[PDB]
Write a protein that binds this ligand. Structure first.
Ligand SMILES: CSc1nc(N)c2ncn([C@@H]3O[C@H](COP(=O)(O)OP(=O)(O)OP(=O)(O)O)[C@@H](O)[C@H]3O)c2n1
Ligand SMILES: CSc1nc(N)c2ncn([C@@H]3O[C@H](COP(=O)(O)OP(=O)(O)OP(=O)(O)O)[C@@H](O)[C@H]3O)c2n1
Ligand SMILES: CSc1nc(N)c2ncn([C@@H]3O[C@H](COP(=O)(O)OP(=O)(O)OP(=O)(O)O)[C@@H](O)[C@H]3O)c2n1
Ligand SMILES: *[C@@H]1O[C@H](CO)[C@@H](O)[C@H](O)[C@H]1NC(C)=O
Ligand SMILES: *[C@@H]1O[C@H](CO)[C@@H](O)[C@H](O)[C@H]1NC(C)=O
Ligand SMILES: *[C@@H]1O[C@H](CO)[C@@H](O)[C@H](O)[C@H]1NC(C)=O
Ligand SMILES: *[C@@H]1O[C@H](CO)[C@@H](O)[C@H](O)[C@H]1NC(C)=O
Ligand SMILES: *[C@@H]1O[C@H](CO)[C@@H](O)[C@H](O)[C@H]1NC(C)=O
Ligand SMILES: *[C@@H]1O[C@H](CO)[C@@H](O)[C@H](O)[C@H]1NC(C)=O
Ligand SMILES: *[C@@H]1O[C@H](CO)[C@@H](O)[C@H](O)[C@H]1NC(C)=O
Ligand SMILES: *[C@@H]1O[C@H](CO)[C@@H](O)[C@H](O)[C@H]1NC(C)=O
Ligand SMILES: *[C@@H]1O[C@H](CO)[C@@H](O)[C@H](O)[C@H]1NC(C)=O
Ligand code: NA
Ligand code: NA
Ligand code: NA
Lengths: 323, 323, 323
C-alpha cells in the first residue's frame, strides 16, 4: 500500500525532476553551433645555428584551426635530378639482381644497377633527386618551441537564438593581451596559449613529443544556458593527444612529413632542398549546444509529464490491485 | 463537457497534424549527407603595379572548401639571416638593459644589445631575418578583387536513398557558365559567385573587409523531400561573417597571416621575401537532410498516433469524471 | 479473441525484441567519437622524363586526412611580368574593339590592344605573367601513380567509455608493414593502401580519373559494441567518388588547380613556373558510434517496455470490448 505512494514519488521526481528539470525539457536547444577559428603563432628559435620565425616553422601558414609547429628537421641541401646510390642500409646491395621490384619505396626509381655508396657499403642505384637523404644520426629539436605562443580567435554563434560570443571579450585591451595568463578554469578568455602549456595539458612531455612529432587536440566547448547571464556563457578548454596509436606503436611512433624548397640557377637547372619535418600538429575542435526557455516546449513537456505521472500511478494501481 | 471534444480536437490535430504531417513522421530520414566541394577562383588585379592572378592571391591553391583571396600585403623584400634593429616603435630602446625577456615577440632573437634604427629612434637589436618588417604607413587593397569569381562544384548524395545531386545541373552548358547570374533565390544553380556579391550577402563592406581581412561563410543547405520532384531538391545558400568577434574587438580586428618566398643566390646564400597577407577567407559549409516515404515509419507513426489520441481522450475523460 | 493474443505477441516482440534487443536500448551510446588521421604517400614516377617523388606530386604535404596526388600537369616555364597575346583561340581578336570587358577571365589584365599570337591567329593582348599557358595538345598522365601507397594512421577514442583503438594494432611489426595486403573485409588493419586499389574500390578507372582529376572518399567507420571483445571493434572501410557531379557534367568533368613555383635571378627580377595540376584528391572521413551496457538505461528501457506492452494490451482489450 505504501509502495503506491513510493512509486508516485519516484514517478513525480523522475518525470518532473530529472526529465523535466535536470534535462531542461522546458528549453529549446540549438545544436547547430556556428564556429570560426583563426590562429597566429609567435616565437623564434635556434636551429642549425639559424634563427627560425613563424614563417619558418609554422605550416600551413594561413592560420586555420589546424597547423604544425616544426620542432625537428632532417635537411638535405641542393638535390638535383640524376643517378646516385641509396643511403640507408635497408637498400644494401651486393649483386645487381638484388635491385629488383621487391625493394621498398626509395628516393627514386631503380636503375637495376648496383653502386658503392661508400667504401664499406654498397647499395642499389636510383634515378631521382640526388643525393638521397641520410638518416644516420638523430637531429636535435628546437627547444625554444616550448615557449612559442598560439593566439586563438574563436567566434561562435547560435543562430536559433541570434547569440554571438567569442573567447576575445569586447573589453579586451592590449595590456590584457600582453599580460594575461591562460588557464582553462582560472582565465578562459586569454587568447594566448603557451605551446609548452598546451603540450603539458595534453599529458605530453615536450622533449619526447618534439622528438617524434605528434598531434594535439585543443577542444573548445560552448555549452551555454542562455537563460542565465551572458557572462555565464564561457568556453571550456580540453586538451589531448589525438594520434593515440602513435605512443602504443613501435612501427610509427610520431608525426612527420616531407616537403621541398625549389630553386633554379641562372644557368636554369632545377635544384631543391629536401626537408623531413617533425612537429606538433594542433587541432582546434569547437563544439557546443545552447538552450533557452521557450513556452512551447514547456507546455508540451509539462503535459507529457502529467500524462507520464498519471500513466505511472494508473499502472502501479492496477498491478497492485490484481496482485 | 464540450472541453472533452475540444481536447479531442487538440489531440487529434497535434498528433495527426503537426506531429504526423508537418513533422513528416511518415518519412524515413537520411541525415548522413555525403558532400564534396571543389572551388576555382578567377580574376586579375593590380597591386604594387604588378598584375596578380589566381596563383598570386589565392591560398591555399588546391581548390578546397576553404581558401583565402589576398586583398592587402606588407611585402618585405630580400631578407637575410643576420643582426639588425627592430622596426616598430614598440621596441624603443635607450639602454641595453631594456632589451630583456619582458619584450614582446619580435622579428628574431634578442642579442641584448641596443642599436640605432634611425637617427631619431633607437631600438633593440635582434638576430634573425633582416631587415625587420616596417608597418608605418598602410598599404592599399586590391580593388579589382571585388570582381573576382568563385566557381563552386558541390556534389551531394544521400546514400540511404541512393540520391545524388549537385549545384551543377546536367543540362549546364558553356553558355550558361559564361552568362548565368547567381542568386540564392532566383538562380541557385549558377556555379559562379562574384566575390563582391558574396561579401555583400554576408553584410560586409568590401573596402573595410579587404582592409582588415576577415572570414566569410558560404553555407549550402540540401534539405530535400525526396517524395517531391527531383527538381524540387535545390540548394539553399546563406552567407555570413564567421569571425564575428573581429568586428566587436579593437585588439584583433580582422584576419591576416605571414608567409615567405624562399630564394638562393648562385653564391648559395639564402634570402627570402616576407609577406604579411590580409585577405578574405571563404568557408563553404554544406549541410542537409533528406526524407522519403517508407511504409514502416508510417505504420509505427500512425499506431503511435492512435495510441496517443486514445491515451489523451482517456485521461481527459477521467480527469473530467473525477472533477 | 485470438487477435488479442496476437497483438500481445506483436507488442511483446516489438518492444522487447526489436526496440529493446536489436536496438540495444540496454546500452549507453557514445556518438562523440574523437578521431585523428595522419597520412604518408610513397612512390616515384616518370613525368616529362623527370623523376617525381612525394615532395613533387603530393599536395598539400603535411599528411592530413585530405591530400592530392598529382597525375597530370600543364607546365608553363619561366613566366615574367609583361605584355603578351592570349594563347587560347577563345580570345581570338581581329579588332581592338573586340578586346573589351565582355571577354572571359584570362592570364592577365586586358590592354585593350590586339596582337598577333601567330601568323595564322591574332588574339587580345594582356598585361600579366607571360607567356600565357597553351592548352593545345593533351599532356600525359603519370602511369606509375597507380602503384603509389597511402599510409593511414587513424586513431579513435570514445571518451565516454575511455576506449582507444587504431587501425595500427599494437602487435604490428615492420614485416607486417612491408608485406600486409589491405582489404576492407580480409585485412582491415593493414595501414598501406594501393592508390590504384583505392581508385578501383571507388568504382573508377585510374586512366580516366587521372586524366580528368577527381575526388575520392575513404570512409572509415568505427561502430563498436564495447560489450563484445576488444578485438571485435574493427574499422569498416568504404570507398567512393565524392565529386559525383563531375562525371555527369560536360562543363566541368574533373578536378584541377593552378599553382606556381617562384624564382629570382641574381639580377633580381622575378620569374615563375606555372603549373596546372590534375590529380586525385583523397578525403579520409572517419565516423563511428559506440555502445556499452549500463544498468540505468536497462532499468529505464525495461520499465518503458513493460509500460508499453501494458498500454498495448490494455488498448487492444478495450477496442476489442467495444467492437
Ligand atoms: C612499405 S610501403 C609504404 N607506403 C607508405 N605510404 C608509407 N608511409 C610510411 N611508411 C612506413 O611505415 C613506417 C611508419 O611510418 P612513419 O611513422 O612515418 O616512420 P618514418 O618517419 O621512419 O617513415 P620514413 O622515414 O621511412 O618516411 C615507417 O617505417 C615508414 O617507412 C610507409 N610504407
Ligand atoms: C604577446 S604574445 C602573442 N602571441 C601570439 N601567437 C599572437 N598573435 C597575435 N598576437 C597579438 O595580438 C594582437 C591581435 O592580433 P592580430 O589580429 O593579428 O593584429 P596584427 O595584424 O597587428 O598582429 P601582428 O602584426 O603583431 O602580427 C596583435 O597586437 C598581435 O600582435 C599575438 N601575441
Ligand atoms: C566565366 S567566369 C568563371 N569564374 C571561375 N572562378 C571559374 N572556374 C572555372 N570556370 C570555368 O568553368 C569550366 C569548368 O571548370 P573546370 O572544371 O576547372 O575546367 P578547366 O580545367 O578547363 O578550367 P580552366 O582551364 O579554364 O581554368 C571551365 O570552362 C572553366 O573555365 C570558371 N569561370
Ligand atoms: C622560456 O622563456 C623563459 C623567459 O620568459 C625562460 O626563462 C625559459 O628558459 C624559456 N624556456 C625555454 C625552454 O627556452
Ligand atoms: C569584461 O567583461 C566581462 C563580461 O562578463 C566581465 O566578466 C569582466 O569582468 C570584464 N572585465 C573588465 C576589466 O571590465
Ligand atoms: C647547369 O649547371 C650544371 C653544373 O653547373 C650542369 O651540370 C648543367 O648541365 C647546367 N645546365 C644545363 C642546361 O646545361
Ligand atoms: C567590375 O567589372 C565591371 C565590368 O564588368 C566594371 O564596370 C567595374 O568597375 C569593376 N569593379 C571594380 C571594383 O573594379
Ligand atoms: C535543366 O534541368 C532542370 C531540372 O529540373 C530544369 O529545371 C531546367 O529547366 C533545365 N534547363 C533547361 C535549359 O532545359
Ligand atoms: C653570398 O654573398 C653575400 C653578399 O653578396 C655574402 O655576404 C655571403 O658571405 C656570400 N655567401 C658565402 C657563403 O660566402
Ligand atoms: C606496379 O608494380 C608492379 C610490380 O610490383 C608492376 O608489375 C606493375 O607494372 C606496376 N604498375 C604500373 C601501372 O606501373
Ligand atoms: C594482434 O592482436 C590482435 C588483437 O585482437 C589479434 O587479432 C591478432 O591475431 C594479433 N596478431 C598476432 C600476429 O599476434
Ligand atoms: C633582369 O634581366 C632581364 C633580362 O635579362 C631584364 O629584362 C631586366 O630589366 C633585368 N632586371 C632589371 C631590374 O633591370
Ligand atoms: Na627512415
Ligand atoms: Na604589427
Ligand atoms: Na582551358
Amino acid at each position: 500500500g505504501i509502495i503506491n505512494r513510493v512509486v508516485q514519488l519516484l514517478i513525480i521526481s523522475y518525470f518532473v525532476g530529472w526529465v523535466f528539470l535536470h534535462e531542461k525539457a522546458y528549453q529549446v536547444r540549438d545544436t547547430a553551433i556556428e564556429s570560426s577559428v583563426v590562429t597566429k603563432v609567435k616565437g623564434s628559435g635556434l636551429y642549425a645555428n639559424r634563427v627560425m620565425d613563424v614563417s619558418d616553422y609554422v605550416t600551413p601558414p594561413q592560420g586555420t584551426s589546424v597547423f604544425v609547429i616544426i620542432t625537428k628537421m632532417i635537411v638535405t641541401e641542393n638535390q638535383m635530378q640524376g643517378f646516385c646510390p641509396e643511403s640507408e642500409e635497408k637498400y644494401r646491395c651486393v649483386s645487381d639482381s638484388q635491385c629488383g621490384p621487391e625493394r621498398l619505396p626509395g628516393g627514386g626509381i631503380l636503375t637495376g644497377r648496383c653502386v658503392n655508396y661508400s667504401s664499406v657499403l654498397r647499395t642499389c642505384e636510383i634515378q631521382g633527386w640526388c643525393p638521397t637523404e641520410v638518416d644516420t644520426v638523430e637531429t636535435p629539436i628546437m627547444m625554444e618551441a616550448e615557449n612559442f605562443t598560439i593566439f586563438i580567435k574563436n567566434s561562435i554563434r547560435f543562430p536559433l537564438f541570434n547569440f554571438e560570443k567569442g573567447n576575445l571579450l569586447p573589453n579586451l585591451t592590449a595590456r590584457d593581451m600582453k599580460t594575461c595568463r591562460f588557464h582553462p578554469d582560472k582565465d578562459p578568455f586569454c587568447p594566448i596559449l603557451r605551446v609548452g602549456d598546451v603540450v603539458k595539458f595534453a599529458g605530453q612531455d615536450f622533449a619526447k613529443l618534439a622528438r617524434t612529432g605528434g598531434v594535439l587536440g585543443i577542444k573548445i566547448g560552448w555549452v551555454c544556458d542562455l537563460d542565465k547571464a551572458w557572462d555565464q556563457c564561457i568556453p571550456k578548454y580540453s586538451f589531448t593527444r589525438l594520434d593515440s596509436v602513435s605512443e602504443k606503436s613501435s612501427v610509427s611512433p610520431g608525426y612527420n612529413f616531407r616537403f621541398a624548397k625549389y630553386y633554379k640557377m641562372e644557368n636554369g637547372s632545377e635544384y631543391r632542398t629536401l626537408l623531413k619535418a617533425f612537429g606538433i600538429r594542433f587541432d582546434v575542435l569547437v563544439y557546443g549546444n545552447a538552450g533557452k526557455f521557450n513556452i512551447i516546449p514547456t507546455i508540451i513537456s509539462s503535459v507529457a509529464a502529467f500524462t507520464s505521472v498519471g500513466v505511472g500511478t494508473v499502472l502501479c494501481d492496477i498491478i497492485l490491485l490484481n496482485f
